[PDB]
Ligand SMILES: O=C(OCCN1CCOCC1)C1(c2ccccc2)CCCCC1
């Protein structure tokens with residue numbers, strides 16, 4: 001009838017306005033400024049000591065929203081042509097906090113999702129190459145890169161680069177990316193299992209905490 | 216004697232020989248020596264100044280075969296395990312001219328297609344590792360690398376490496392490669408959309424110029 | 431009982447794994463990790479090509495009929511786990527393989543995770559290994575030997591011109607997927623895939639014909 005297609009894009013737009021109003025009106029456990037300031041506070045000492053102190057601070061300020069020491073493990077992350085490792089501390093459907101970094105020189109595509117991802121370097125260097133330009137920037141400990149919603153860059157990390165990462169938005173929209181290189185390159189399905197496990201642990205902790213505070 | 220198998224073999228051989236004869240007896244808008252000399256002439260300037268001057272020269276010598284300024288945009292190129300960026304100026308089924316390069320350190324497979332691809336460096340370095348050897352060669356501004364037909368090499372580019380590229384042959388035979396990393400790694404389908412858009416704009420410009428000559 | 435069928439599948443997989451593991455534990459092998467490691471470190475002070483030739487000659491002398499001749503040796507590109515190198519296969523069976531590996535460009539990525547132990551003795555260059563579960567990597571130089579253990583997955587990195595002698599023992603088919611992924615979902619270099627299939631078929635047929643010659 002020459003009209004049906006306008007109704008499908010209108011239904012997707014209704015869904016998008018619904019989700020956008022929800023994400024703009026929702027309450028969040030953390031904010032990117034809090035995580036960025038906490039990470040920049042310990043940017044002067046060793047990155048492992050910084051990891052420990054930031055974990056302690058996050059468990060103190062937000063009890064029931066951070067995994068315990070028995071649930072912390074380093075999991076390899078192969079995505080977008082790069083390879084690093086993560087230690088997940090918090091994860092819901094709209095938020096995640098983790099410690100990211102690499103001990104090797106890597107780089108590739110940063111991904112493009114419906115979420116905002118901030119990274120505060122604890123040690124090393126962080127080269128970001130934004131879209132549409134011919135020049136990149138290097139960020140140092142204390143600085144923070146804000147991978148905006150819907151924008152795609154090229155990331156490059158030198159050996160020994162470690163940072164604290166906070167993401168807010170629609171978290172599932174990232175999942176595919178985080179697994180792509182594992183499905184079509186590394187074939188390390190044990191790491192896939194580890195990732196699914198730690199994500200499930202964080203989600204279950206968050207759900208049980210929501211159950212407890214309601215009653 | 217199996218008849219359908221022999222017929223398939225003979226038909227595919229006749230099709231390949233037909234395409235080969237058409238490529239051997241076809242007229243072309245550019246040649247690799249033209250693009251290479253034009254790029255080497257301006258290789259001593261800043262690569263952005265060189266970009267401007269090379270675009271102006273290409274539009275002067277070949278009017279109606281280069282996209283206008285409102286249609287030029289930098290689109291990411293993830294392929295063969297490396298990540299760079301392109302600005303497509305011309306593209307047909309048998310030719311393409313573009314500005315390629317990266318602002319990060321990358322490298323990977325060069326691909327292996329039925330087309331000859333020449334790259335003249337305006338800035339940076341270009342490490343080529345030919346097939347069947349244990350040593351590579353570094354190339355500097357002014358040099359021209361010819362990725363030959365059916366040949367596969369290893370490419371590596373340092374941060375800030377920019378070059379002018381001309382490809383001639385059966386251009387569609389590259390498409391799969393050019394999209395592989397996008398489908399199974401980056402999942403950046405908006406960059407895929409940009410690539411499809413610019414390639415379609417170039418093909419439409421070429422068909423429009425073909426129509427303008429006849430009437 | 432649907433649980434009966436799933437338990438049957440689990441028990442069958444378990445008995446097959448146990449059968450293959452017992453066979454690997456009770457099998458005789460042509461080479462060992464220490465042999466290849468010491469032989470490569472012996473020539474690790476020369477240029478990597480002179481070392482290549484000397485190691486090939488010594489290996490063909492000590493184990494005749496188990497290593498390809500000069501007419502079957504060729505360099506084949508190897509894209510895997512996000513890194514790109516080159517290999518020259520000298521020996522390969524279902525449980526063993528010996529080859530020369532290395533890269534002329536700076537590369538790195540996932541090391542893979544298979545049911546086989548893979549040793550690499552550096553003849554030239556540098557080898558950065560990043561073990562799983564740690565936040566620090568380690569660089570190894572010519573003369574050193576890296577042991578990619580069974581079931582472990584690391585991050586590998588090699589600088590331009592790094593060359594080594596590789597020996598793998600275990601269930602070699604368990605590597606096939608990792609060896610082909612980048613070719614299927616990235617490089618599309620099916621001619622390099624053909625070359626890989628060709629050299630491995632040559633090696634397998636060499637092993638089979640050598641075993642037939644022993645019996646008659
Ligand atoms: O842990 C990650 O990767 C950080 C690396 N950074 C690099 C810079 O760009 C953003 C991602 C991601 C994750 C993995 C698993 C659970 C939750 C999140 C976060 C989104 C990006 C890929 C996967």
Ligand SMILES: O=C(OCCN1CCOCC1)C1(c2ccccc2)CCCCC1
Nearest residue numbers: 292294301315325332334362370389393
């Ligand atoms: O834009 C590109 O990439 C140049 C980079 N070069 C670097 C040297 O080796 C060949 C590729 C390609 C393209 C393909 C199709 C349309 C428009 C552009 C050209 C072929 C290689 C990948 C895709």
Ligand SMILES: O=C(OCCN1CCOCC1)C1(c2ccccc2)CCCCC1
Nearest residue numbers: 508510517531541548550605606609626
């Ligand atoms: O020949 C290879 O490539 C060695 C590369 N090495 C480098 C050091 O780390 C381990 C892998 C492999 C292969 C290629 C082709 C067919 C069957 C196997 C052997 C298993 C490990 C990867 C792929």
Ligand SMILES: CCCCCCCCO[C@@H]1O[C@H](CO)[C@@H](O)[C@H](O)[C@H]1O
Nearest residue numbers: 125127136137138156157158374375
């Ligand atoms: C990636 C971690 C740092 C590696 C050493 C880089 C030293 C400076 O490198 C420079 O960085 C600039 C911004 O990216 C670019 O303009 C230059 O092309 C690049 O040479």
